[model samples]
Target: SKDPTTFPLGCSPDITTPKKGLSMELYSYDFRKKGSYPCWDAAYLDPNYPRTGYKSHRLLAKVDGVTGNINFYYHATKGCTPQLGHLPASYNYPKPLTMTNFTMLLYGYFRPKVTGFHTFTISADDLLFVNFGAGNAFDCCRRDSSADHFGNYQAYAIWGSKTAKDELTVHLDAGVYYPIRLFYNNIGKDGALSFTFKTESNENTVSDFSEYFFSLDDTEEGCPGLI
Candidate 1:
């Protein structure tokens, strides 16, 4: 049978921004201590409650005075919950899924005490899914080598002015639901201070689970005003 559907058959209500009153927390990893890691300790900032429309995920860190030109690395991967020792039967795929049409936004400030340029590197590996919602489910996993490479990764940097604040933003288009990792380095003599990081899902709609559904209009598919 010829495929009757024109647009992709998936969940909708896509566009989402941080809820107006939600908040986030910052954490620091101590490389020297093996067991000193803290719980997924997070901070909360909810000013508007139900009226709020989005969630905020952010990370903030301070630079060490002795360390010069520090670098931060991060990566996001997809799979069944890590608690399971092996891939769940549902996720068994002939091949890993790859993402497309992905986007990224980088925003932060650099202190004037820093005297060199800071560089940020971003990368992604693309793949394909066989069964998206079946069993363990076949889906795109970011930063995984086994997945197919979609060929849309990127890297860039910006120079800082002494004693001044600087901001940088990057745009990307790979896919949705795939994990994203960000790495940053201070390439000069002084270290960048007051560093903050954030990641957001970029699409045309505004509801939770919109990507699973395909509706971008923020309308109710069944229940009253459910979007």
Candidate 2:
């Protein structure tokens, strides 16, 4: 039987304490009138980089509008890079709008063809609003890709509410996965905004070739096994 996947993997060497977790909080804002409230700047060391020799994946969130304020949260098995960039450092958009309900989507895949099982855990808090009967709104994270390089690319998402928090996990065997994309969108009465996250693995295979495979495989099994 398969056991429920949990947060904080036991075999991660970089993480000594199980309590250590990765998380980020973002508030909705109007980009057009507010003039890019979040100020997202893509970084050089971002996990989504291409030439770093790794596969890359992305996570997307869409918020719909309704009538009241809403709160959402995300926790990851690993820490994330704060900078956002794809080179040239340019700002262009209608900006994002505030909404009511929030939906999250994660997409990516493992690479380099390993021979074992891998596991990844993600948790997201459910949609919440300050007022009732406000109506429904929508938003989402857009799909993105790396410039061109090599590395492990994998992503995951988790969901939760007052009663229970749900998790979504993605797995990749030794073979190359296709498209490797995930998406979600929510709509309400207020407005909408989208959030996205992506990354690649940093494993080395040969001198000339680096392994672009991201795996949560703490066990001995290579690509097909999981903890």
Candidate 3:
């Protein structure tokens, strides 16, 4: 039963509470020239990739009109008409962001409302990877996705390819803030990335977890630069 309306009732988190959404950053490298064959490659995941420009934003689970405005939960490809997804426009930032040849890094903590096994579905174009409770920021910059990142990590997907789709189930505890990092890159056009979690008995949308999406601002004090 994947009915969104049938989701169990739970009190949403306080909007006034700090760190509501995930911190998002877009890093642009070079322009997609004509000769650049195989536009999609894993090189962009390398930390040393020269970042020509960047812009900051937030991925809110719910736009409560008080804390945030963007709610990037289920922007998956709807029909042949691909969804625009949740990235800024080319001219949205001071330094114009290249429509292509760019990477998105989203880091923050996610708190589950009820302790149980949750299924996560990830879909993205080009390359994508996600790590939980591990060296999230460190692994995001690492060139090798297979390399061992020493931590209590639960890697959902590594080196996911073009329009890569992955599904995984893992156990979690309620009210526990788990560190999370989502790395995704785009080469040409129709760039898309989405992460959705569903409980053992209920498919939870971003709105279901609205009260628990902790931003980097919430825990940066202890782990500064934790991406």
Candidate 4:
């Protein structure tokens, strides 16, 4: 079920300065044609949006918390109740658009307190692709075709299966700022996405990694990631 684990040792919620959130760029296509959006498998591979070109793009409001959840159906029945609903409330965002037409590129560092081998998990609609390295907005769209390309990415999930979650385990050192990148998009109704992690020995998981998240300019232990 990919549940969250208990709060781990050496990690605290005291971080408040330098903005404890992930920097995100939101994109949407204005082309209303039937085939404008990318195909199911090409969602993350498509370089036309949020990378080479897009109908509209904006630096969305910084998203706090480890999980970013949004669903148009729930908003229609209830209120604007998505975890990231306020993201587009800022200036210069595309006019009100459906959840299906939105794609987001997130890049930042994850500082682990007691890292060894940790497992990361994600469940979402449409698609979610994740990789670890020094990467920017443009790097998120292209496939890493090099010899180590397979090692660059950690996990991916497509076809919009809410019940299907992808997981990857990697070894990392404590006090190191690991460059992390993610691509999330919704090609159909009611979009939702989540990220959670847990240590190898821990039975509990955590969905809120904001305390460990840092931006490119945060400079805690020096920057090792790209924009």
Candidate 5:
């Protein structure tokens, strides 16, 4: 059973705008951290999780109020419960939400074309944490590390159909692929997240924009991940 005291990692939402010159770029944010995160803490101590190189576009979910089953990966933001039939065609998970504790662990990589300082934005029905980097080095916003290398966006807005975003900014060095990880849970109602970024180019773009950000609709994992 999941420890509810520790089940939900706390964080603030960032849902606003970029600076005057910074625009959303064609990239996926990943990297180093300076503090700590609950997700990384679990990954660090739990033997069930992959130690390195987690298979991308997949999620390890525990439903029924964080005390249920596992078998997941999805990208949906429905006001009502979602249909498993609506997931990506090739994913392996066979079931969908129970509308309870929809705890999800998303693993993958993100491609940053030419990064300088990248920002991550998030909007979620309940809670969302965009973890960065891979292995023990993963800086999932709340995780504690040494050198901060990537973006960590944490957002919370769990009522009346809405979301928020942009609590942190990460430094991505150019032409690199950083490990990507996301932790999301919708206690009830709609569950979704809008996580995107801003770089030196194409500034202020929407996070869900597939062409610039990457998605299952077009690009494959280089961060799909292949931004």
Candidate 6:
């Protein structure tokens, strides 16, 4: 039988226990408002991301002529929506978030203190891809109904389904840092994306917040720029 998915038993991580969890930064942007035609609105994932980088106010530089300047910041767990399918039709977009078509990207590192099996989950409505580098990338919980959702991208072709609760596990080395690359798309009606994890020591409820970031967790030490 498969090991059932786990949940929190209440209570957050023991802060004084050193590095035992994860923290992250969220950046949301897409070409719904620009290029050859216009349909959706544009905004930032972290509305406060300087609007301009040390380089410029541009959120994200051009990619063959597409601009994704809007940005946002967030921890992992809080990325899960309390709405998605649970909301009424009248409640179109989630309060703060803009409507569909915009892309949400989460970039950060996972700090594992123990070397063993770890279960990581990526859940979403439209589509999502979690890439841990080294071809260790996987697409999970994608809503297939949105067939032509992402234009010409065939690989992202409606493979997973909406409200997909996908999970996977991998053995990792303790004291090592893994770059986290998480992508989420809200091309249709509703939107959702959240990263959750469970290990031998912590409950299925590992959290995403700022406190874990206090020590800098050495995320900036070895990795440098990626943080």
By lDDT, who's the top model here?
4
Candidate order (TM-score): 4, 3, 6, 5, 2, 1
lDDT for model 5: 0.35
TM-score of 1: 0.19
- TM-score each candidate: 0.19, 0.25, 0.56, 0.60, 0.42, 0.43
Candidate 4 lDDT score at position 65: 36
- CA lDDT, every model vs. true structure: 0.20, 0.23, 0.45, 0.50, 0.35, 0.35
lDDT of 3 by residue, 50-123 (tens): 12222222222222111122222223333222223433322123343443446665555666777777777776
Model 5 lDDT tens row, 134-226: 332232222233223333332333333434544445666453444444555554334455555677566664443222221111122211112
Ten residues in sequence with the least summed lDDT for candidate 5? 20-29
lDDT of 1 by residue, 1-227 (tens): 11211111122123442111101112221112334332211121122210121123222322111112221222224221111121112212122211111111221111111222222222222111111110111112211231222122222223322323333233222232212212222211222223322224422222122121111112233111111
Looking at model 1, residue 133 earns an lDDT score of: 14
Q: Taking the tens digit of each residue's C-alpha lDDT, what string does model 4 give over 155-210? A: 77775355368887766667655556677776544566667788866688776564
Top TM-score hit: 4
Q: How much lDDT does candidate 2 score?
A: 0.23
How does model 6 score by TM-score? 0.43
lDDT per residue (tens digit) for residues 1-227 in model 6:
01112210111122234342222222343444334233333232333221232122223211111111112222222222222222221112223433343454443344456767777665665555554521122111111221112211111212255436666566665544444444555544445555556777757556443222111222211222221
Stretches of candidate 5 off by over 4 Å are 1-96, 99-101, 134-163, 204-227
Q: Give me the displacement of residue 163 in model 1, in angstroms.
A: 18
Q: What clash count goes with each model? A: 39, 50, 1, 6, 19, 12
Which regions in candidate 4 have their CA more than 4 angstroms from the true location?
1-19, 34-97, 134-152, 160-164, 218-227
Q: On a 0 to 100 scale, what is the lDDT of residue 106 in model 2?
A: 26
